[PDB]
Amino acid sequence: LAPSVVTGVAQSSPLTIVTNPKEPRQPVPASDGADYLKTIPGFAVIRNGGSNGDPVLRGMFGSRLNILTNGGMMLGAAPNRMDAPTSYISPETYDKLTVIKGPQTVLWGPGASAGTILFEREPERFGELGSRVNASLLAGSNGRFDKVLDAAAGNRLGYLRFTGNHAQSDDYEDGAGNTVPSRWKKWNGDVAVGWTPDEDTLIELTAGKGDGEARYAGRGMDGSQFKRESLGLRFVKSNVSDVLEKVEAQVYYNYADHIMDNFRLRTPDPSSMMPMPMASQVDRRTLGGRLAATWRWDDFKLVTGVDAMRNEHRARGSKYDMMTDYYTDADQFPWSKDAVFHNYGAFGELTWFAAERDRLIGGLRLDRASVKDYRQTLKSGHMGHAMANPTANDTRADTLPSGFVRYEHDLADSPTTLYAGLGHAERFPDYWELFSPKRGPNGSVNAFDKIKPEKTTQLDFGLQYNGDKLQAWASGYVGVVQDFILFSYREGMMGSSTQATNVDARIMGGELGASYQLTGNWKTDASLAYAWGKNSSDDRALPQIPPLEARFGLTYEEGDWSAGSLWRVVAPQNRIARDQGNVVGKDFDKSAGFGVFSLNGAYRVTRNVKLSAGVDNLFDKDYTEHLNKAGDAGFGFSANETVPEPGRTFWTKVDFSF
C-alpha cells in the first residue's frame, strides 16, 4: 500500500511492458511522449532541447516504432522531425501505456520493426450516477510547473469525460553552470462523450486540441506552434454470438499544424548561413480507421480485422526581402501540398492455449501501401534554385506481408515463463525517408524514386521469473534488416546535405532486469539494456546506437510512505559511423561514460491526496548522452558539442483523487 516514485518498469508478460503514466517518475519527464519511455528499459531519447525528444528503441529510430493514441496514429509535419509524433502526446493524460517489443504484433498497424507503443484512455464505467476526478500539480527547478486534470460524470447509460493538462518549463542549466536554450510550454484538452444503452454496447465520440512552443538548443530553429486537433469515433459490441465476443470499429482524424522559425524564441544567427527572419509552416492531416472481430472457442482467441489510413502533408514558408527588409510571414501565402500516403491492410492473430503451460501465438498481415509525390518542383541544383521534379505526380505502391510466431512455455517446478518468437516485418518508407533527403541512392533521380522498403527478420526470446521474493525478466533479440534506410551527411556550399541509402544491417541486443524484496520494507532492483548494430554493406558499425546502460534502485517502505535512491551508469559507445545516422542525428564522436544519482520519496497523506518529491542528478554531474543533437553554434557551442543533460534538479508533486 506504500506509494512510490517509478524509476524503472519490468516486463509484465513476454515482450510486453505495461505501465500507468500518471504515477510519479524519477528522472522527471518533460511533458511529452518520449520521456515517459526513458523509464522503460531499452529506450533512449535524442535530446533536441528541453522537451520533444525523439524515442529510440533498441537503437531503432523513428517510424520503426508504432506510436498510437487510442489506436489512432498522430503524425508529425516537420521535414526535420521537430514535431515528432511524441511532441503531440502528453502521457499524463492517458491511463495506460503499453509497449510491445520487437515485430510481434499485427493488430495495431504496419511495419513495426522495433516495437509498438500504445497510450490509451480506458472507458469509464458507472454504477448509478457518480463522478470521479483526478488532478495533479508538479513544481520544480527552472520554472517547471505542470497542472493536469481528468474528470468524468455519468450513469448506467452514458458519461462525459474531460482531461486536460498544462505544462511549462524555462531553460534548464547543466552540471557545469551554463543555461541551455530549452524553454517550453504545452497544453491539451480532450473531451469524450460515451453512450452505453446496455452493458454489451459502447459508443464514444472524442474531440481534442493542443498547442505548444519549445526552444531547441540542438536545432537551428524553434517550435513556435504545435497545434493539434483530433476527432474520434469508437464503437464496440460484446457477446454478439457465443464464439464472436467483441466487435470494435473506430475512426480517427488527427490534424497537426506546426510553425518553426528563428525569431520568436531566438534571434537570428548573425554569422550563421541563415541570418534572415525565417519561418516555415507545415500541416499533416490524417484520417484512419480500424475494424476488428475477436472470436473465441475452445482454446483459441483469434482476432481478424482490416484497417486503412490516409495522410496529407502541406507546407509554406516565409519570404524575407533584403533591400526593403519587409518580412512577409508564411500564413500570407498559399498552401503547397506535396505528399499523400495511403495504407489499407488486413490482419489476423491466432492464440492457442494448448495445455495449462504452453501458449502459441501467430500473426500475419497484408498491407497495400502507396504514396504520391505532388511536389511540382524541388529546391535543388544550385543555391537551392527551383528545378522540375522528375517524380512530379508519380505514384509508388507495394504489397507487404508481415507476421510472427511466438512460443511461450511455463516450467513446472519454478514460476518461470520461457518464450521464443520469430517475426518478419516490412515497412514502406516514411515521409522523411522519401522527401526529406536532398539526394537518393548513388545515381538516382531523387529519393522518392529509388528508396526500397525495409524488411526486418528478427528472433526474440527471454524469460520471466515471478516468484515470492524475486521477480526477474529478460528479453533478447537477434535480427537482420535488409534495405535499412540510412542517412549520410556531406557539406558543400550551403549546409549539411543528407542522402538516403538502402543497406543491410545485422542487429542484436537485449534487456534484463530483476527486483528483490530483502525485508518486509527494503526493496532493491536492477535493470540492464544493450543494443548492437552493424552496417553489413560497408562493414561499418551502425550509427546512432545507444550505449550499454544499467540502473540500480533501492527502496525503504513503511505502509504510509517510501524513499528511494537510484544509480544510473552508462558506458561509453565506441561503435560509431561518422556523418551517418538518421534524418535527425549525425554520428560524430565516441561518447563518454558516466553515472548519475537521484533521490525520491512519496507520502500518502490521505485517501485522496498523495505527495512525492525528488532530486535528479544529486551530485550535479555535467554529462551528455551519445544520441543528443549538436548545439547550434549561434548558442555558443564548440566544434561538435552535444547538448548537455540537466544538472541538479528538484521536483515536488501532489496528486488529488476525489
Author numbering: 66 to 723
Copy out sentences from the published article reporting this entry, exactly as the authors wrote them.
C143A has no bound copper even after incubation with 10 equivalents Cu(II), suggesting that this residue has a crucial role. While OprCWT and most single alanine mutants can be (partly) loaded via Cu(II) incubation, this is not the case for the C143A mutant. We hypothesised that removal of the cysteine could lead to much lower affinity for Cu(II), so that after SEC, nothing remains bound. To provide support for this, we determined the crystal structures of the OprC C143A mutant cocrystallised with Cu(II) or silver Ag(I). For each crystal, datasets were collected at 8,800 eV and 9,175 eV to distinguish between both metals. Bound copper is expected to give a strong anomalous peak only at 9,175 eV (which is above the copper K edge at 8,979 eV), while bound silver will give comparable peaks at both energies (the silver L-III edge is at 3,351 eV). For C143A cocrystallised with Cu(II), no anomalous peaks are visible at both energies, showing that Cu(II) binding is indeed abolished. All 4 residues in the OprC binding site contribute to copper binding, but not to the same extent and, in some cases, not equally for both copper redox states. This is illustrated by Cys143, which is essential for high-affinity Cu(II) binding but dispensable for Cu(I).
Here, we show that Pseudomonas aeruginosa OprC is an outer membrane, TonB-dependent transporter that is conserved in many Proteobacteria and which mediates acquisition of both reduced and oxidised ionic copper via an unprecedented CxxxM-HxM metal binding site. As indicated by the successful structure solution, OprC contains a single bound copper and shows the typical fold of a TBDT, with a large 22-stranded β-barrel occluded by an N-terminal approximately 15 kDa plug domain that, like in other TBDTs, completely occludes the lumen of the barrel. The copper binding site comprises residues Cys143 and Met147 in the plug domain and His323 and Met325 in the barrel wall. The CxxxM-HxM configuration, which coordinates the copper in a tetrahedral manner, is highly unusual and has, to our knowledge, not been observed before in copper homeostasis proteins.
